[PDB]
């Protein structure tokens, strides 16, 4: 039947829209997780090198 | 008074209120009026550890020779003394700073002598 095929089309269209929305969501999720992890790694070179340099400052002064 | 000069060259101290609104200029007397539990000692140590003059704004460059601290302590109680000593030794200023320490248990007449033989 026509509406046999049309309800099959509706199920396929809702599944395809569902998975496209899920693709956009998963891409934004891996984007935000990678941005947070790289903000971590960018902050850690500051948080470690500043400690190392201040240690050499006070060691040289001592 | 004929042989004085105008205290004229901008010290930035890092503290935003002192840098923007109540400027500390090199050659000035300005006391920190504090209360009884307020952190006066930490503000004094912060101005000790980061006060610099910026000559690029001034227009000269010409060097960066840093400050020499003279710390004249009259009757502090080994807690404030330990904070000042630990701060100056972590920043490394003790190779430029003389400390006339008169602790609290030491007798209460040589507090007259202390600021004169510091200045």
Swiss-Prot record, chain A:
Please, which domain of life does this record's source organism belong to?
Bacteria
Q: What does this protein do?
A: Produces ATP from ADP in the presence of a proton gradient across the membrane.
Provide the family line: Belongs to the V-ATPase E subunit family.
Its name, as the record gives it, is V-type ATP synthase subunit E
Species this protein is from: Thermus thermophilus (strain ATCC 27634 / DSM 579 / HB8)
Lineage start: Bacteria, Thermotogati, Deinococcota, Deinococci, Thermales
What gene is behind this protein? atpE
UniProtKB/Swiss-Prot annotation, chain B:
Q: Has UniProt tagged this entry with the keyword DNA-binding?
A: no
List the GO molecular function terms.
Answer: ATP binding; proton-transporting ATP synthase activity, rotational mechanism
Which superkingdom is the protein from? Answer: Bacteria
Q: Could you tell me the keywords of this UniProt record?
A: ATP synthesis, Hydrogen ion transport, Ion transport, Transport
Q: Which GO terms describe its biological process?
A: proton motive force-driven plasma membrane ATP synthesis
Role according to the record: Produces ATP from ADP in the presence of a proton gradient across the membrane. The V-type beta chain is a regulatory subunit.
Q: Which family does it belong to?
A: Belongs to the ATPase alpha/beta chains family.
Q: What is this protein called?
A: V-type ATP synthase beta chain
**Gene for this protein?**
atpB
Q: Which part of the full protein is shown?
A: 121 to 239 of 478
